[PDB]
Design a protein around this nucleic acid. Sequence first.
DNA 1: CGTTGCTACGCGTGGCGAGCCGTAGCAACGGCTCGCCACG
Lengths: 593, 593
Amino acid sequence: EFPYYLRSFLVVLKTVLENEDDMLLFDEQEKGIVTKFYQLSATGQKLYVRLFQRKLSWIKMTKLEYEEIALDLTPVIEELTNAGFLQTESELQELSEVLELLSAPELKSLAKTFHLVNPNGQKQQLVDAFLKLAKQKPGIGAVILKRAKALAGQSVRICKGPRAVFSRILLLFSLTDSMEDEGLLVNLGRMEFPSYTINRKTHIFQDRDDLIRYAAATHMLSDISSAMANGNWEEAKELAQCAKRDWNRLKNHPSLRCHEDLPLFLRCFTVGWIYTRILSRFVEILQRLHMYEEAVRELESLLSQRIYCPDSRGRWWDRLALNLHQHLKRLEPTIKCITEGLADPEVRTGHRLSLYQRAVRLRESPSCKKFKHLFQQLPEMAVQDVKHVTITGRLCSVEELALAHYRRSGFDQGIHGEGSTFSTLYGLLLWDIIFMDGIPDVFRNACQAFPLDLCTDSFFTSRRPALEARLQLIHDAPEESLRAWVAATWHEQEGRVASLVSWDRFTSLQQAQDLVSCLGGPVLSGVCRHLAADFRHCRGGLPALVVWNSQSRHFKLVEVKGPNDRLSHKQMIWLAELQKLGAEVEVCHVVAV
Amino acid sequence: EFPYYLRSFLVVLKTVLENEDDMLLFDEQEKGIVTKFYQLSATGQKLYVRLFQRKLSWIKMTKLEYEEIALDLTPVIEELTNAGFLQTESELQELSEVLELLSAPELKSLAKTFHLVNPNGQKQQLVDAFLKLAKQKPGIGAVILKRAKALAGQSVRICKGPRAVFSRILLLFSLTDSMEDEGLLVNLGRMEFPSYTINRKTHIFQDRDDLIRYAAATHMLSDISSAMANGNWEEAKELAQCAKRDWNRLKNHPSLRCHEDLPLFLRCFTVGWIYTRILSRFVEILQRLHMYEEAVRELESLLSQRIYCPDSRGRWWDRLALNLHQHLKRLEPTIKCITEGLADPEVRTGHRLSLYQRAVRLRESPSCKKFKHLFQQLPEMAVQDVKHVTITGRLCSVEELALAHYRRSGFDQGIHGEGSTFSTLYGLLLWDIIFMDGIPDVFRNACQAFPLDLCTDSFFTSRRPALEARLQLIHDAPEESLRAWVAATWHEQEGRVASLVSWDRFTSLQQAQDLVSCLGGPVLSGVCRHLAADFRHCRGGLPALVVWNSQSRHFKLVEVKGPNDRLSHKQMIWLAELQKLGAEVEVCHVVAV
DNA sequence: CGTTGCTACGCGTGGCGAGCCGTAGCAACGGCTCGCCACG
């Protein structure tokens, strides 16, 4: 009667409409369209949202079925058409769009009609043949168009004007979903968020145009990503080349100056940052296509600016070196690269370790004896040793095999939760700081699962005195404090959606209390500090497993590796860090059976 | 020249005289008195009605002033006296009546005259002293009488014979005004009533005597009510005890058998029903006087019969339990009471909830562990949860504060109209059914504001097919239908007095149309069904407020509660019902500032 | 309900009447607040 998708869609409109500065990014005709949506019947609102969620393409009217809305959709379609929200096949004027609308038999039929060869050819071959055939001013395109429409019959499509309005509203509601591909899910009407106070101070978008350019970059990034994921690297390349063309064409626009003044945790919500991300995928595409030459200039270009994606610099330096070392075989620029990279303070310890490791390799083979004078800068960056055990396989999940073995070794409890285990404890012990008042712009509407600066260096620096006082309080805390604090947060917040916290990670509050008792205050303090100080990079390197003996309270943090799986650099940096806090860590290899 | 009070008085006489069966309830001398009234001059008719509206007591002739009738009333008084309509002080023969007529100085003067002590005592003390002094066959009463009359001077009083004739005529004209205290206002000459056709089939009063007994019960109920309202509970008790004596003295009279055969919506216009109401106030009086013992037998007596005031049974059961539980502290009869009450199908959901709530309380404390075997009958009567918000106070009207807050929350429209808002919409959407032909005895003269069965279960059952067809038609109605129907009734009936409909509740037809558009057909259908099916009990529990956003058409039904105000059971039953129809409901608490 | 001077003793509203040689008891006194009823 009042279905979820409509409810959730209504929440988003309400939120965005509520904020006057966001509303200044739309003109009067655009606001008028939201009004028109509100003036639709209920059955009309339901169909529009069911169609708005679908891929933007034409749909045959005989394929439209939503029994829960109406047994015959025709008058609803009619309402939406009169209101300017759907268009009918009278406005279907693009040959590609209609060729996309036909089934396989129909395309074949049309093919025979125009005497195409290979009519039993695949759809994409037919589509391609027809469009070429249409390129014979003016062309026979018009005739292929009318005959295809005769076949397709009555059809509707979501109009693009109104759709783009809702599209930008959606963007405004959840900015952290825009670059999510590579911080709007169904429950939105029903999920309870944490409490905090909205506090805005800074404009992200300079004007209506700024938002529109932002949104177009977003869609392009989404397009390119889609292509790459399906292995369509050639299409992925051309899309990236166009995106590349739009970006230079836009550089030195006055709006960019204002973007540069935003703090990093807002700056990721700007057009330039998005094109930088686009350029970064461009690198991967060039490599898949073996264009290692071209990949290197793009890397050097990315690294030559310092306004966008500083987080990415380590990945860039490391890939630049790899291309220089291996595919280009240029030994002296490679040394230069590693040394610049090592000097770059944005590079976190993982890539740093990776860069250094490559230096050692280069300094120690016939190929580079002569460059010896370029290796004296080398830091003494070392990472401490861990213990490795092996267990035999079975026919199954490698973590579950590990868990069974540690239960045989006296560790009757165990959790396979990766980073979520610690991040959940972090969440439970530091909730009121994660969600504290007084930090401008980190909470911009009432539907966030985290403060916007969470995954940014300024999270810690903006809450430093409270953090310093809380981490000291944890480090010294006796068991009973630890158990109590966890219970407090658990009791007061259970169910509330906080991105750090998985309410189902533990089998119960008691299990979580038992775990914090075994880990103890110093260890917990150490891990919470790392997560607060540098959450992106810490969450990823943490051991698969935590196991413990409920009698002795002996615990081990265990990383599990099956055949052909080894430690990444991140994992090596964090097993050592954990070891430094005095936790016992172990790597468990499952061997082929 | 032709003043309102006379016009209205003339309308009543005309109506009643017009009906021959009503006229059979008066004898020839009584009809003769109406004739004599008609034979009075105009100035005579005006004075009589101005005196008939006044309290029945003696009036000093030097206090009579009606300049608009005559600058000297003497010959008019003379006309009314000759005609037998007023009596003069020659017939003032009751010591109490004359002691009531004297001012404060005069009573003091008389007091000194008869050597009363405390002559500076209050009037009621003097009045009481004189009447005691008169009790010294025969007594000195005669002497106090003559000396008081010497002081009071020329005085007149409305004669009781003719007055009681007009009194019964008034009763006959508007029977729903008789029990109104606890369904004859000035405009009567000028108010336009709805259209409908008179259709009588059943005699309410068996004869002249029946009507007279009915009227005397009415006056007693009015007396007792007056007493209670002024906190004269002791006088209220004695009046009730006499009334109690008259009722038993009357039980098994043959006229009662005919009253029992009347449908409920006429049966309320009978002597027995009135004494039942009298007995019900008797309960409240006994409690005010802390006679909780006696209150309980009266309750048990009321509940032991099923012919009168079935509507009241829930109130009775609930008060019986309260007296048993709290003041008598009898735990086992209390359980019995609640269980009988819960079994009583006359008890509506409000008192039902109240009864159950008391059961839970009794089943869950040391006092009643042992009675566990008496609690197994317990129904699973549950009532769903609502949302509660709080806002800060200001120095002002709690509903107006709420309205200001919801305007801040984006609800630019709002109405504080309680039940009248919905009942007005009900009225506008169902007018021609509320006033339809074909239901015998619901329209008995041309001056009714509602069908007589309106507030009775038989309203719905007597119009069920038309109601079922109309509520289905509303449930499915598109916005444009809703707006149109409301406009139709508004246009055709505006001004006509219908008790359900407040022509001033909305600021205009358009506001009402905008509201019905936001509420939508299903919700409206749900509320109209409740009001049709059970109008007494539904109108009272409805939220103070309806607020809405004119753009999104989001609406909320809001109940407002200031300090020390909480939800009644009725309100809890109807917030849930509204919630069931999918309306969004909210309780707004204003907190002390 | 004060202040004080003398006597005796040792249904929603507005208008307006009613109410409130010292020392202890009481009646008059006005300003003020309340309740009742007529009225539209």
